[PDB]
Write a protein that binds this ligand. Structure first.
Ligand SMILES: O=C(O)CCCN1C[C@@H](C(=O)O)Oc2c(NC(=O)c3ccc(OCCCCc4cc(F)ccc4Cl)cc3)cccc21
Ligand SMILES: CC(C)CCC[C@@H](C)[C@H]1CC[C@H]2[C@@H]3CC=C4C[C@@H](O)CC[C@]4(C)[C@H]3CC[C@]12C
Ligand SMILES: CCCCCCCC/C=C\CCCCCCCC(=O)OC[C@H](O)CO
Ligand SMILES: CCCCCCCC/C=C\CCCCCCCC(=O)O
Ligand SMILES: CCCCCCCC/C=C\CCCCCCCC(=O)O
Ligand SMILES: CCCCCCCC/C=C\CCCCCCCC(=O)O
Ligand SMILES: CCCCCCCC/C=C\CCCCCCCC(=O)O
Ligand SMILES: CCCCCCCC/C=C\CCCCCCCC(=O)O
Ligand SMILES: CCCCCCCC/C=C\CCCCCCCC(=O)O
Ligand SMILES: CCCCCCCC/C=C\CCCCCCCC(=O)O
Ligand SMILES: CCCCCCCC/C=C\CCCCCCCC(=O)O
Ligand SMILES: CCCCCCCC/C=C\CCCCCCCC(=O)O
Ligand SMILES: CCCCCCCC/C=C\CCCCCCCC(=O)O
Ligand SMILES: CCCCCCCC/C=C\CCCCCCCC(=O)O
Ligand SMILES: CCCCCCCC/C=C\CCCCCCCC(=O)O
Ligand SMILES: CCCCCCCC/C=C\CCCCCCCC(=O)O
Ligand SMILES: CCCCCCCC/C=C\CCCCCCCC(=O)O
Length: 360
């Protein structure tokens, strides 16, 4: 079949690229995750678990590459061949679940009604164990054609596919869709409220900026304090305190100095606004990247995988569908080197921590 020549030319290249990009990205990421960072949240745990899984899977891609460079011949043993499948599917579904967990955690962080480090490790251990246990029949106590689909494997894999498709791909993707919905909702409502607070404060600052006497400045500062009342919370409302100082000046009759005080109070409020809007932005970013990962890496692969299993026959080549499966399989594997784009653009000050970790 034509697809066999295609795979022999295609997989060595893509796998070894994924290996090179993935060892670099994950080793660097893991190094950053293991270095001490004071304000490190449970996010750090989930990313780290993902990174480690991704790296363990990447350590197998040379062997796969080897298989195809030899003309689809597995020279390693039966056990290494079983480990190929075991690593591939454990890493796949572990990754999907850590990513789902990371989006959920990041949503909870914006809403905050926390995941501690120890709890994050327990949740990770449970994910590891459930998925390793679900996968052990890939390790059953032919092999020359290690990575192929054959007629003895097809009956088991049809049943295995049903369950892995539903529970390991569609259920987490559904969870991600709900997460996106919830994050958009929270972000829009919170940003509407932040606009209203900013605008009330700016109204009163404009009033104070052109006020006739000290009583008027005092009244508008009082209204400002009423607006300031109602996750760092601006160092326990630092702006609200500075306003109290300005109100003292007002009650002393110092109009010019109270106006001067009010006019630098414009910026300390948007400091608060941003300290609590950056978490909402982190969650939006996490969910958008993760959904792109699903649409690129996992959903086409599970679709075509299912159709391939369903329509498979030992005599027929099925070249277009099989080639589409091969390319989507490559994208499922490439996820292991994609995941640091998440770490970098949606980690916890990851660019800062990288700069600090590499500087001599
Ligand atoms: O190269 C090529 O020509 C193309 C690929 C050939 N090829 C090679 C073959 C191969 O591997 O050798 O695989 C296929 C499959 N495999 C599956 O359809 C499957 C379905 C399920 C499955 O489950 C593993 C354990 C999952 C445990 C789990 C985790 C969860 F998170 C939730 C539930 C569960 Cl149960 C493994 C494979 C389907 C179609 C083709 C092949
Ligand atoms: C991944 C895919 C399926 C995402 C689904 C897209 C649609 C169905 C989602 C994405 C954003 C969602 C909206 C987000 C915000 C709100 C405000 C809320 O007070 C009413 C529901 C409403 C209007 C949601 C409706 C459903 C919604 C439009
Ligand atoms: C040939 C086979 C190749 C295999 C390649 C080896 C893969 C393992 C690499 C790094 C492990 C990192 C160990 C991570 C330990 C995490 C626990 C921890 O130390 O805590 C983390 C953080 O500091 C507080 O939560
Ligand atoms: C980016 C990496 C893309 C690699 C694809 C190589 C295709 C080789 C082929 O089709 O023969
Ligand atoms: C930056 C590292 C990323 C590595 C990504 C590897 C995944 C490759 C996925 C898609 C590439 C598609 C190439 C298709 C070539 C078709 C050739 C042909 O039709 O004969
Ligand atoms: C140590 C792993 C050996 C296998 C090679 C894999 C690539 C290296 C990946 C991560 C190396 C991290 C180095 C150890 C950091 C210890 C934590 C610390 O520095 O405090
Ligand atoms: C690590 C080595 C990277 C290149 C792997 C080549 C595997 C092979 O011999 O085909
Ligand atoms: C994930 C790639 C395939 C590896 C098979 C199972 C790996 C389990 C090893 C280490 C889990 C680390 C726990 C932290
Ligand atoms: C398969 C090969 C095995 C891979 C080995 C990777 C496991 C390494 C470290 C696992 C970390 C477990 C530490 C628990 C965290 C302790 C804590 O709660 O602070
Ligand atoms: C096997 C599971 C290994 C994965 C994570 C280990 C963390 C266990 C929690 C210790 C506290
Ligand atoms: C999120 C909710 C997920 C709902 C899933 C319900 C049904 C999905 C069934 C997928 C069908 C796979 C067919 C595989 C086969 O026929 O062997
Ligand atoms: C969002 C996640 C839910 C997505 C899809 C629901 C399940 C769709 C599966 C259709 C199954 C067709 C069949 O019965 O064979
Ligand atoms: C498919 C999952 C099974 C149905 C469970 C119901 C999920 C619907 C809404 C959950 C939203 C929770 C956010 C608060
Ligand atoms: C919200 C940010 C947009 C979502 C990401 C879109 C495309 C993927 C590119 C990832 C890098 C952009 C992230 C920008 C950022 O850090 O806010
Ligand atoms: C979002 C990005 C989606 C891109 C996925 C990449 C390749 C999938 C191509 C699927 C083609 C299916 C129709 C061809 C066929 O199999 O007959
Ligand atoms: C087929 C579509 C090709 C997409 C390949 C790489 C894009 C994602 C890289 C991150
Ligand atoms: C060799 C086996 C594969 C190792 C690949 C690991 C790649 C990057 C690991 C990161 C090491 C970072 C240490 C930098 C020194 C420093 O702290 O300044």
């Amino acid at each position: 079949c034509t697809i066999e020549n295609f795979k022999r030319e295609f997989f060595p290249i893509v796998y070894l690229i994924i290996f090179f990009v993935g060892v670099l990205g994950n080793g660097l990421s893991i190094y950053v995750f293991l270095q001490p960072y004071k304000k490190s949240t449970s996010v750090n745990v989930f990313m780290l678990n993902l990174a480690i899984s991704n790296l363990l899977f990447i350590s197998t891609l040379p062997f796969r590459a080897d298989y195809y460079l030899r003309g689809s011949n597995w020279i390693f043993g039966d056990l290494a061949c079983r480990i190929m499948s075991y690593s591939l599917y454990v890493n796949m579904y572990s990754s999907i679940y850590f990513l789902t967990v990371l989006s959920v955690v990041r949503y909870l962080a914006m809403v905050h009604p926390v995941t501690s480090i120890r709890s994050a490790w327990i949740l990770c251990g449970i994910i590891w164990i459930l998925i390793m246990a679900s996968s052990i029949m890939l390790l059953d106590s032919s092999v020359t054609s290690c990575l192929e689909l054959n007629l003895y494997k097809i009956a088991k894999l049809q049943t295995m596919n049903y369950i892995a498709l539903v529970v390991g791909c569609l259920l987490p993707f559904f969870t991600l869709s709900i997460c996106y919905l919830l994050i958009i909702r929270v972000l829009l409502k919170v940003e509407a409220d932040l606009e209203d607070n900013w605008e009330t404060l700016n109204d009163n600052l404009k009033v104070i900026e052109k006020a006739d006497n000290a009583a008027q400045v005092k009244d508008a500062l009082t209204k400002m304090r009423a607006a300031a009342l109602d996750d760092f919370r601006h160092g326990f409302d630092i702006l609200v305190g500075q306003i109290d100082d300005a109100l003292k000046l007002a009650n002393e009759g110092k109009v010019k100095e109270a106006q001067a005080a009010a006019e630098q109070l414009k910026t300390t409020r948007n400091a608060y606004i941003q300290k609590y809007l950056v978490s909402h932005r982190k969650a939006l970013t996490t969910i958008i990247i993760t959904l792109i990962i699903f649409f690129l890496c996992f959903l086409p692969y599970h679709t075509l995988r299912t159709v391939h299993l369903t329509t498979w026959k030992v005599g027929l080549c099925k070249d277009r569908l099989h080639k589409a499966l091969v390319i989507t399989l490559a994208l499922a594997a490439a996820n292991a080197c994609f995941n640091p784009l998440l770490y970098y653009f949606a980690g916890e000050n990851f660019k800062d921590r990288l700069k600090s970790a590499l500087r001599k």
